[PDB]
Amino acid sequence: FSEKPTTKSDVKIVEDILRGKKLKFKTDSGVFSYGKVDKGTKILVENVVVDKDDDILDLGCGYGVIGIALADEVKSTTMADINRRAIKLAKENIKLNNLDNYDIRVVHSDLYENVKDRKYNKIITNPPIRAGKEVLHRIIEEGKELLKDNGEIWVVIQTKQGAKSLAKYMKDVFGNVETVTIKGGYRVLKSKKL
Incomplete structure (x- = not known):
């Protein structure tokens, strides 16, 4: 069932620079990476390669870092998370970063369950x-x-x-895998459908 809590939430606004963009994010103690942009997320966002015609999915979006950092560089962005508070913050963060002119949607989803309406x-x-x-x-x-x-x-x-x-496992499933970068104990892995 669903319920609207009575408890307060701790909020911290965080700014950072990703892909050379000055972004701002409202974060919350009940959402991943409260108070700072996660190092792994930062490495991933700096290294991902996207095309202007890409339709992308940021899975397990949290407060929206990946989708927001890439939104102006692609055709459409879908951010999904099972945490309702996360969904709320990502929507608010789209406004904090002036991305209202782009095709971005935030969807509540248990993994891919609610975002299979497109490829x-x-x-x-x-x-x-x-x-x-x-x-x-x-x-x-x-x-x-x-x-x-x-x-x-x-x-x-x-x-x-x-x-x-x-x-x-990715090579098992896709028939290929590539390590794009290894930095400070984190690895960015990429597999292509084909």
């Missing part, structure tokens, strides 16, 4: 880890089904055997 050129995500490898594998396998031909899925994951195990 995407890119699926970009900083996936949850404590949730376990089964959820990680699902992000990869179901992701392939939602990508347009030549589409790509981009993930950031903390290095060593974790990134290696996931890369192996």
Whole structure:
């Protein structure tokens, strides 16, 4: 069931520079990366390559960093999260960054469940880890089904055997995987549909 809480939320406004853009984000203690832009997310956002005609999906968007940082560079952006507070903040953050003139939507979704109304050129995500490898594998396998031909899925994951195990699975599923960057213990992995 759904319920509207009585409890207050802790909010912290954070500014950062991503892809050379000066952005501002309202963050909340009940949402991932409260009070600062996550290092993994920053590395992913700086390294992802997008095309002006791409329809992209920011999976597990939190307060919206990835979608917001890329919105003006692509054709359309869908940000999705299961956390309702996250959804609210991402919508508010679209306004804080003057992106109202772009095709951006924020959708409540348990993984891909509510965003399968279109196909995407890119699926970009900083996936949850404590949730376990089964959820990680699902992000990869179901992701392939939602990508347009030549589409790509981009993930950031903390290095060593974790990134290696996931890369192996991505190669299993897609028939290819590439390490785009390794920085400060984080790896950005990319697989293409084809």
